[PDB]
């Protein structure tokens with residue numbers, strides 16, 4: 289049977305605010321036949337709240353030596369004022385926890401488009417440290433941040449607001465995630 293990929297995160301993993309099927313997770317699920325994606329994303333979620341989601345799943349999870357676990361979070365924490373050290377440290381805890389039940393894939397969260405000279409710098413600092421951690425531990429990374437930054441910079445309409453992708457932004461993210469998921 290299929291591979292299982294379990295996805296955790298906030299509203300940008302859940303797919304706010306487009307029809308079911310058009311968030312990036314769901315695009316990926318419709319694009320790969322023998323990989324089944326389950327979305328545990330939760331709107332409004334903080335990085336510590338995601339840990340709780342992972343724990344509540346992990347205590348019920350069957351052993352599965354081909355499972356992958358996708359994680360991405362921290363935007364809400366950054367919007368509420370937390371610094372890159374807090375966000376990064378808490379994500380590492382999530383990554384260590386998820387690693388006990390599957391092979392982890394890390395997503396680099398997208399830009400804070402309302403504050404490219406303030407809050408977005410925290411996002412960038414988190415993402416640099418994540419790339420360094422993943423290289424050290426041989427964990428796959430999906431760089432969503434770069435995908436949408438480049439597209440928006442050239443004039444593609446990809447954001448519906450200060451952080452949420454629109455449908456175009458979710459398609460571009462799905463393509464970028466598929467570069468990793470397809471090779472598993």
Ligand code: NA
Pocket residue numbers: 316317318319320321322323324325
């Ligand atoms: Na599928």
